[PDB]
Amino acid sequence: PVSVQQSLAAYNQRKADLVNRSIAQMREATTLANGVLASLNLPAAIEDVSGDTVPQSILTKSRSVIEQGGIQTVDQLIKELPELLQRNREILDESLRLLDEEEATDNDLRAKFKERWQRTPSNELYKPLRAEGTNFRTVLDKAVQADGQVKECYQSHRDTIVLLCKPEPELNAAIPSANPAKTMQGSEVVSVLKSLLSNLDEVKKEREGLENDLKSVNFDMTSKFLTALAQDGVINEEALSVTELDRVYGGLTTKVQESLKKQEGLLKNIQVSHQEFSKMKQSNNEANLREEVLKNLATAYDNFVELVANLKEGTKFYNELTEILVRFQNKCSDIVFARKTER
């Protein structure tokens, strides 16, 4: 309660959460937009003015996947995961084998002798280790569950990706060619839509800035903490941190609230606008093919995007988890060493 070192540790904890939480809000909002925006396929069906073909905000989206490497990026990563996770089951399962085994020796030693086997029991001693052990496990299970959720997600969408790596066959398939092109071109309500759609980008973009700006902050409370100790007999970490957390992130916290509760206005004022776009109800047949598809295309893009990250980071994770468990292992085997070497 008067240690600067621990006081610092708290700040990093409190700082990290502030930042993380803030990043998460923005990343979930960006995806929630893309879902809405592709649930109504706006980029696709404004650029559909030239009905015939429509290589538009999707050839765009196809080029960037070709750039990306297509499934050959995904399909490679996905197959790689179970091995990584198996590595991790194993390290944990050994650590606990080591433990279960000495413990069993110990248990029969006090059984055979009694008084004369007077050390403190492995029962009791490895209770923390086990506690620790079972959390790793919790992590794994949830990791398996999340990894399951992924395998369905791409598995399902995959069809709609393979078809997005074509330069001219793209038409003959993707394009149903509905003949729907309306003289309803760049009319008043179609331009108010383009800007309201490109505003959302200037919104989409700044979120990188906001994110990076948030991570780039480093403050260092040491001086602040020492001075509180040398003025009062104590350190009141919560109060010191809160007050300096606002001074340092409060200006980036509003920019976060002001990116979110601005998206609110931009969202609900299009649900309306997109209906005020189709009170002309086009054609419930050929344009169906023209419609539902474009709606099913941007989701194939959006979902691909969110699919590399999940993967890339599940990987990153797994290898950090590993370097964590190994440490766990060693600790178990050290403690085990301590017991044979004991007395």
mmCIF file of C-alpha atoms in Angstrom, residues 187-341:
data_model
loop_
_atom_site.group_PDB
_atom_site.id
_atom_site.type_symbol
_atom_site.label_atom_id
_atom_site.label_comp_id
_atom_site.label_asym_id
_atom_site.label_seq_id
_atom_site.Cartn_x
_atom_site.Cartn_y
_atom_site.Cartn_z
ATOM 1 C CA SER A 187 -30.735 11.162 -59.148
ATOM 2 C CA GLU A 188 -30.899 13.465 -56.088
ATOM 3 C CA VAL A 189 -31.470 10.598 -53.638
ATOM 4 C CA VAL A 190 -28.620 8.552 -55.170
ATOM 5 C CA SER A 191 -25.955 11.209 -54.526
ATOM 6 C CA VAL A 192 -27.134 11.825 -50.943
ATOM 7 C CA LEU A 193 -26.510 8.092 -50.634
ATOM 8 C CA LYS A 194 -22.962 8.091 -52.087
ATOM 9 C CA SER A 195 -21.770 10.799 -49.683
ATOM 10 C CA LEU A 196 -23.535 9.193 -46.712
ATOM 11 C CA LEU A 197 -21.705 5.999 -47.714
ATOM 12 C CA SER A 198 -18.301 7.701 -48.147
ATOM 13 C CA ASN A 199 -18.737 9.555 -44.850
ATOM 14 C CA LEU A 200 -18.771 6.160 -43.227
ATOM 15 C CA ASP A 201 -15.322 5.521 -44.686
ATOM 16 C CA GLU A 202 -13.808 8.730 -43.242
ATOM 17 C CA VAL A 203 -15.376 7.227 -40.134
ATOM 18 C CA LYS A 204 -13.975 3.712 -40.844
ATOM 19 C CA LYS A 205 -10.497 5.128 -41.470
ATOM 20 C CA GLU A 206 -9.997 7.357 -38.436
ATOM 21 C CA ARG A 207 -10.483 4.270 -36.293
ATOM 22 C CA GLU A 208 -6.936 3.218 -37.184
ATOM 23 C CA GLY A 209 -5.718 6.649 -36.145
ATOM 24 C CA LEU A 210 -7.702 6.526 -32.921
ATOM 25 C CA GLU A 211 -6.459 3.020 -32.221
ATOM 26 C CA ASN A 212 -2.802 3.779 -32.899
ATOM 27 C CA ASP A 213 -3.015 7.066 -31.032
ATOM 28 C CA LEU A 214 -4.344 5.098 -28.001
ATOM 29 C CA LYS A 215 -1.590 2.482 -28.073
ATOM 30 C CA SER A 216 1.146 5.066 -28.687
ATOM 31 C CA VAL A 217 0.538 6.708 -25.260
ATOM 32 C CA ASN A 218 3.087 5.945 -22.493
ATOM 33 C CA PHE A 219 2.961 7.992 -19.329
ATOM 34 C CA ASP A 220 5.056 6.660 -16.442
ATOM 35 C CA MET A 221 3.541 7.217 -13.019
ATOM 36 C CA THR A 222 6.710 6.586 -11.064
ATOM 37 C CA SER A 223 7.400 10.219 -10.328
ATOM 38 C CA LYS A 224 3.721 10.678 -9.538
ATOM 39 C CA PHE A 225 3.793 7.690 -7.212
ATOM 40 C CA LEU A 226 7.029 8.535 -5.401
ATOM 41 C CA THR A 227 5.793 12.121 -4.744
ATOM 42 C CA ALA A 228 2.572 10.816 -3.208
ATOM 43 C CA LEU A 229 4.713 8.669 -0.899
ATOM 44 C CA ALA A 230 6.916 11.596 0.063
ATOM 45 C CA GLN A 231 3.994 13.886 0.876
ATOM 46 C CA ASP A 232 1.593 11.540 2.517
ATOM 47 C CA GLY A 233 2.817 8.406 4.282
ATOM 48 C CA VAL A 234 1.048 6.331 1.612
ATOM 49 C CA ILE A 235 0.186 5.691 -2.023
ATOM 50 C CA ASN A 236 -3.521 5.797 -3.062
ATOM 51 C CA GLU A 237 -3.086 4.158 -6.423
ATOM 52 C CA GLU A 238 -6.692 4.118 -7.505
ATOM 53 C CA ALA A 239 -7.039 7.902 -7.131
ATOM 54 C CA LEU A 240 -3.661 8.760 -8.633
ATOM 55 C CA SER A 241 -4.342 6.599 -11.669
ATOM 56 C CA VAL A 242 -7.901 7.622 -12.329
ATOM 57 C CA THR A 243 -7.046 11.270 -12.301
ATOM 58 C CA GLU A 244 -4.070 10.829 -14.579
ATOM 59 C CA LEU A 245 -5.899 8.306 -16.770
ATOM 60 C CA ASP A 246 -8.397 11.031 -17.758
ATOM 61 C CA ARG A 247 -5.761 13.718 -18.408
ATOM 62 C CA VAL A 248 -3.989 11.238 -20.700
ATOM 63 C CA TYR A 249 -6.866 9.342 -22.430
ATOM 64 C CA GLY A 250 -9.960 11.507 -21.764
ATOM 65 C CA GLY A 251 -9.251 13.380 -24.979
ATOM 66 C CA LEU A 252 -9.073 10.097 -26.889
ATOM 67 C CA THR A 253 -11.961 8.609 -24.986
ATOM 68 C CA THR A 254 -14.416 11.178 -26.318
ATOM 69 C CA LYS A 255 -13.095 10.737 -29.863
ATOM 70 C CA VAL A 256 -14.102 7.087 -29.270
ATOM 71 C CA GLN A 257 -17.590 7.987 -27.959
ATOM 72 C CA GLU A 258 -17.766 10.467 -30.808
ATOM 73 C CA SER A 259 -16.943 7.809 -33.367
ATOM 74 C CA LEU A 260 -19.554 5.467 -31.917
ATOM 75 C CA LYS A 261 -22.529 7.736 -31.128
ATOM 76 C CA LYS A 262 -21.945 9.369 -34.531
ATOM 77 C CA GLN A 263 -22.268 6.041 -36.338
ATOM 78 C CA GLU A 264 -25.728 5.874 -34.642
ATOM 79 C CA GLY A 265 -27.023 8.857 -36.655
ATOM 80 C CA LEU A 266 -25.429 7.524 -39.854
ATOM 81 C CA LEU A 267 -26.973 4.048 -39.340
ATOM 82 C CA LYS A 268 -30.642 4.779 -38.633
ATOM 83 C CA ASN A 269 -30.707 7.530 -41.305
ATOM 84 C CA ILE A 270 -30.058 4.970 -44.098
ATOM 85 C CA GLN A 271 -32.403 2.142 -43.094
ATOM 86 C CA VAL A 272 -34.862 4.896 -43.976
ATOM 87 C CA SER A 273 -32.952 6.191 -47.018
ATOM 88 C CA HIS A 274 -32.545 2.764 -48.648
ATOM 89 C CA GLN A 275 -36.337 2.260 -48.463
ATOM 90 C CA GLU A 276 -36.803 5.747 -49.922
ATOM 91 C CA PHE A 277 -34.698 4.270 -52.744
ATOM 92 C CA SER A 278 -36.920 1.282 -53.549
ATOM 93 C CA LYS A 279 -40.522 2.539 -53.365
ATOM 94 C CA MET A 280 -40.101 2.001 -57.110
ATOM 95 C CA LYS A 281 -39.917 -1.784 -56.439
ATOM 96 C CA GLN A 282 -37.707 -2.869 -59.347
ATOM 97 C CA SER A 283 -38.441 -6.437 -60.587
ATOM 98 C CA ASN A 284 -39.177 -9.429 -58.318
ATOM 99 C CA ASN A 285 -37.517 -12.054 -60.543
ATOM 100 C CA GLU A 286 -34.397 -11.140 -62.532
ATOM 101 C CA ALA A 287 -33.413 -8.390 -60.090
ATOM 102 C CA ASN A 288 -33.777 -10.942 -57.261
ATOM 103 C CA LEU A 289 -30.779 -12.709 -58.782
ATOM 104 C CA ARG A 290 -29.189 -9.269 -59.157
ATOM 105 C CA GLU A 291 -30.037 -8.397 -55.573
ATOM 106 C CA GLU A 292 -29.550 -11.305 -53.121
ATOM 107 C CA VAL A 293 -26.208 -12.102 -54.800
ATOM 108 C CA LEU A 294 -24.600 -8.678 -54.215
ATOM 109 C CA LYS A 295 -25.872 -8.984 -50.624
ATOM 110 C CA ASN A 296 -24.222 -12.416 -50.498
ATOM 111 C CA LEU A 297 -20.970 -10.993 -51.932
ATOM 112 C CA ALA A 298 -19.917 -8.236 -49.544
ATOM 113 C CA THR A 299 -20.582 -10.614 -46.646
ATOM 114 C CA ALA A 300 -18.192 -13.030 -48.350
ATOM 115 C CA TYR A 301 -15.626 -10.224 -48.344
ATOM 116 C CA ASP A 302 -16.324 -8.969 -44.806
ATOM 117 C CA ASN A 303 -16.279 -12.457 -43.399
ATOM 118 C CA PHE A 304 -13.033 -13.260 -45.170
ATOM 119 C CA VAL A 305 -11.443 -10.176 -43.593
ATOM 120 C CA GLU A 306 -12.520 -11.070 -40.056
ATOM 121 C CA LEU A 307 -11.396 -14.635 -40.840
ATOM 122 C CA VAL A 308 -7.728 -13.920 -41.411
ATOM 123 C CA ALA A 309 -7.484 -11.927 -38.175
ATOM 124 C CA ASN A 310 -9.154 -14.548 -36.025
ATOM 125 C CA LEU A 311 -6.716 -17.021 -37.549
ATOM 126 C CA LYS A 312 -3.507 -14.929 -37.597
ATOM 127 C CA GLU A 313 -4.168 -14.017 -33.917
ATOM 128 C CA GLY A 314 -5.249 -17.510 -32.783
ATOM 129 C CA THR A 315 -1.874 -18.557 -34.155
ATOM 130 C CA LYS A 316 0.040 -15.718 -32.436
ATOM 131 C CA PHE A 317 -1.841 -16.673 -29.276
ATOM 132 C CA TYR A 318 -1.097 -20.379 -29.423
ATOM 133 C CA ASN A 319 2.643 -19.768 -29.578
ATOM 134 C CA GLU A 320 2.502 -17.413 -26.658
ATOM 135 C CA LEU A 321 0.405 -19.959 -24.781
ATOM 136 C CA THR A 322 3.180 -22.404 -25.456
ATOM 137 C CA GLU A 323 5.988 -20.307 -24.128
ATOM 138 C CA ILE A 324 3.635 -19.916 -21.116
ATOM 139 C CA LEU A 325 3.000 -23.649 -20.518
ATOM 140 C CA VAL A 326 6.718 -24.591 -20.916
ATOM 141 C CA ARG A 327 7.375 -22.256 -17.992
ATOM 142 C CA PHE A 328 4.589 -24.077 -16.268
ATOM 143 C CA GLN A 329 6.168 -27.380 -17.093
ATOM 144 C CA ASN A 330 9.609 -26.561 -15.795
ATOM 145 C CA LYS A 331 8.029 -25.296 -12.569
ATOM 146 C CA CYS A 332 6.312 -28.622 -11.989
ATOM 147 C CA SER A 333 9.418 -30.577 -12.794
ATOM 148 C CA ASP A 334 11.467 -28.280 -10.531
ATOM 149 C CA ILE A 335 9.095 -28.771 -7.653
ATOM 150 C CA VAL A 336 9.216 -32.509 -8.456
ATOM 151 C CA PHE A 337 12.994 -32.434 -8.389
ATOM 152 C CA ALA A 338 12.761 -30.668 -5.002
ATOM 153 C CA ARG A 339 10.869 -33.644 -3.544
ATOM 154 C CA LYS A 340 13.143 -36.471 -4.646
ATOM 155 C CA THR A 341 16.117 -34.332 -3.739
#
